[PDB]
């Protein structure tokens, strides 16, 4: 049915009460430190 969920009041606003790792090795020219 219709149940409350939160309160408005124009000062405080709307208090809404809802609750890949890839390994390699270094060998030229396969993989090099850039």
From Swiss-Prot:
Recorded coiled-coil stretches: none
Domain of life: Eukaryota
Subunit-level organization: Homotetramer and heterotetramer with GRIK5. Tetramers may be formed by the dimerization of dimers. Assembles into a kainate-gated homomeric channel that does not bind AMPA. Can form functional heteromeric receptors with GRIK4 and GRIK5. Can form functional heteromeric receptors with GRIK3. Interacts with DLG4. Interacts with NETO2. Interacts (via C-terminus) with KLHL17 (via kelch repeats); the interaction targets GRIK2 for degradation via ubiquitin-proteasome pathway.
Family: Belongs to the glutamate-gated ion channel (TC 1.A.10.1) family. GRIK2 subfamily.
Role: Ionotropic glutamate receptor that functions as a cation-permeable ligand-gated ion channel, gated by L-glutamate and the glutamatergic agonist kainic acid. L-glutamate acts as an excitatory neurotransmitter at many synapses in the central nervous system. Binding of the excitatory neurotransmitter L-glutamate induces a conformation change, leading to the opening of the cation channel, and thereby converts the chemical signal to an electrical impulse. The receptor then desensitizes rapidly and enters a transient inactive state, characterized by the presence of bound agonist. Independent of its ionotropic glutamate receptor activity, acts as a thermoreceptor conferring sensitivity to cold temperatures. Functions in dorsal root ganglion neurons.
Further comment found in the protein's record: The postsynaptic actions of Glu are mediated by a variety of receptors that are named according to their selective agonists. This receptor binds domoate > kainate > quisqualate > glutamate. It does not bind AMPA without coexpression with GRIK5.
Record protein name field: Glutamate receptor ionotropic, kainate 2
């Amino acid at each position: 049915g219709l149940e409350k969920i939160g309160t408005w009041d124009p000062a405080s606003g709307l208090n809404m009460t809802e609750s890949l790792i890839v390994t390699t090795i270094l060998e030229e020219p396969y993989v090099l430190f850039k």
